[PDB]
Amino acid sequence: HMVKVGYIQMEPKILELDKNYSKAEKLIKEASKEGAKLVVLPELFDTGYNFESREEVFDVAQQIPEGETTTFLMELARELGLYIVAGTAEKSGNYLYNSAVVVGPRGYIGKYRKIHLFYREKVFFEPGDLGFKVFDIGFAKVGVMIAFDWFFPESARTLALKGAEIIAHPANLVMPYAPRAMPIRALENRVYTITADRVGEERGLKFIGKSLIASPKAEVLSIASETEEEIGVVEIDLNLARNKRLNDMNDIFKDRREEYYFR
Template sequence: MPSWGENLYNWHYRIIIMKVGFIQMNIEILDVKKNVDNAINLIEKNDADLVVLPELFNTGYNFNNKGEVLGVSEKIPDGYTTKLLKEFTENTDKTIVFGLSEKTDKGLYNSLAIVSKGEYIGKYRKIHLFFDEKDFFLPGDLGFKIFEIDGIKIGTMICFDWFFPESTRTLALKGADIICHPANLVMPYCPEAMKTICLQNRIYSITSNRVGEERGLKFIGQSQIVGPDGKIIFRASEDKQKAFHVEIDPLKSRDKNLNPKNNIFNDRRADFYELI
């Protein structure tokens, strides 16, 4: 069976089918093995080609001190979690985007990694750190990145990055077809805001959030997939684990026309945006 990327030879017809999804899960603080096992169990129930897991899915989020974070941080790609998920995707068509704490010689980063079909693809480091994250992590230094897999361009950001419109606009201008968005959302704003963001950029987004409560911090769930028209394709509940996937045509993101006379990129007046 041909992979979803093999249909790109004639994208003008915009008829490629790609299964994309997310894992919304409960996460146990500091229990890496349990969290990874839970994620793999849920992924096995998900028939998606592209699966997005939450931010820091393997460690939890609400750390008491930097020592806790350091104890569960890993090298990328040589750490336990990346190696295990890479091996899991061998002999499959799956691509997995997942958040984890990255250990480096410089310090720790709130990062995500991508593995696909038994290969390590790359990583992104969160640029906009939220609240106590600033006590534990260094701000990301790799820029907003696009990863091309079977001809589909995947843009990446992590949780609070969404709050800055420059994040998603940069990814869209770099040609992303889909924005993969691992998150640990606690504020209520993101699910609705992503509708406007996707409409403004004519792009798909996949937000994978977690559920449950961790040391008094409650997460809002509502993982979702939004289309380039700003409409919610599917939104999960606020409190239940969910493995979901849907078929989309990612090349719809390459059509930036609102009507015969308006193209959202061609109509930009960058000469008046100098403050940005």
């Protein structure tokens, strides 16, 4: 029930997919050498984020799972024998999704499409349409949400109610709030959260770094720098997320009272 997990905090170079593959591969191998069995890459790690036109991301975005971002992550996951959640610009026909792929030592596992688009993402991407999915990676159930999804408590809650024990959270954070909020997201759902942020400035847009892993007890287990590329790997106890007990008289999920919510 003890597993080592980690984020990959990296600086995507916008439109330079290959360079971004090489950087992700370098850091994931570092995380692998620290024993990470699950690693999370930031939102849109392959394409970067601050596009000027839909055309410039459309011209580089890859298809899932045939495209080269997914196939690259598949080869790396098979080579290292770990699981990867990574944000990627999804090409699907004539459309773009702000997505995340999940891959493991045996290949593609599935994808999530960002349900809550943030700001100018609505210019480029279609709203996610696959719902909030939880993926079985053998030793854990991992839910996936992307960046702004954190702002809506319903995102983490839906994943957690579907059995997610870890929420993998690729992010390109620009607002200051998520590092303060994610321990609450972890605590209120009694899950672990892995927020893999990017760093850097991109056409004048500053990302905040501060990738962090939070425990079901709102403990910040690891937090990254504001500006530097780095990994963070920690050993987590999945029993602490499977057991929703707060004390001998409160089980968080058994204590929910759906009849009084949203009505």
